[PDB]
Amino acid sequence: AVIAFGKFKLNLGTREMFREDEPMPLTSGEFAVLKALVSHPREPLSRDKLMNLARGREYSAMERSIDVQISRLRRMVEEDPAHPRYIQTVWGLGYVFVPDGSKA
């Protein structure tokens, strides 16, 4: 279902994410993008497959952005876009989502 954290809060079903209360809109592209990652936990996929997955039917076949999107996504989830937690960007791979942390 939705994805909430100790402080952060996210929900695809409602497409509403916030941290502590700060309401943040997640456009199709964004949500779809993240959703993709939230669709496959611990699954490293290339930047292409990233937007690709998000690029299904809904209006997500135009906003070709992942590096800029992810970065922004890594922020909302992690105030500090340097030391994330549920976002493990791999240059070799692409973008993996390891919740809590186990093995990149």
Swiss-Prot record:
Please specify the portion of the entire protein covered by the chain, as first and last position out of its full length.
Answer: 136 to 239 of 239
One cellular component term (GO) for this entry is: protein-DNA complex
Residue ranges of DNA binding: 1-99
Keywords assigned: Activator, Cytoplasm, DNA-binding, Phosphoprotein, Repressor, Stress response, Transcription, Transcription regulation, Two-component regulatory system
Superkingdom in the source lineage: Bacteria
Which molecular function terms from Gene Ontology are attached? phosphorelay response regulator activity; transcription cis-regulatory region binding
Q: What is its main location?
A: cytoplasm
| PTM statement from Swiss-Prot or TrEMBL | Phosphorylated by EnvZ. Phosphorylation stimulates the DNA-binding ability of OmpR. Dephosphorylated by EnvZ in the presence of ATP.
The entry's protein name is DNA-binding dual transcriptional regulator OmpR
Give any extra note attached to this record.
Cross talk between this and the Che and Ntr two-component systems can occur at least in vitro.
Recall the taxonomic lineage recorded for the source organism: Bacteria, Pseudomonadati, Pseudomonadota, Gammaproteobacteria, Enterobacterales
- A GO term (biological process) for this protein? phosphorelay signal transduction system
Q: What happens when the gene is disrupted?
A: Loss of expression of OmpC and OmpF under low and high osmolarity. Deletion of both ompR and envZ leads to loss of both OmpC and OmpF expression under 0% and 15% sucrose. Cells no longer reduce their internal pH in response to external acid stress.
Role description: Member of the two-component regulatory system EnvZ/OmpR involved in osmoregulation (particularly of genes ompF and ompC) as well as other genes. Plays a central role in both acid and osmotic stress responses. Binds AT-rich DNA. Binds to the promoter of both ompC and ompF; at low osmolarity it activates ompF transcription, while at high osmolarity it represses ompF and activates ompC transcription. Involved in acid stress response; this requires EnvZ but not OmpR phosphorylation. Phosphorylated by EnvZ; this stimulates OmpR's DNA-binding ability. Is also dephosphorylated by EnvZ.
List residues traversing the bilayer.
Answer: none
Record remark on domains: Composed of an N-terminal response regulatory domain joined by a flexible linker to the C-terminal DNA-binding domain; the relative conformation of the 2 domains alters upon phosphorylation.
Subcellular location field: Cytoplasm
Q: How does it assemble?
A: Monomer in solution. Up to 8 OmpR molecules bind to the ompF promoter; each 20 base pair (bp) region of the promoter binds 2 molecules of OmpR, which may only interact upon DNA-binding. Binds to direct repeats in the 20 bp DNA fragments. At pH 7.1 protein is monomeric, as the pH decreases to 6.5 and 6.1 about 70% is dimeric, which is poorly phosphorylated. DNA-binding ability increases at acidic pH.
Q: What does the induction field say?
A: 1.8-fold induced by growth in 15% sucrose, no change upon growth at pH 5.6. Part of the ompR-envZ operon.
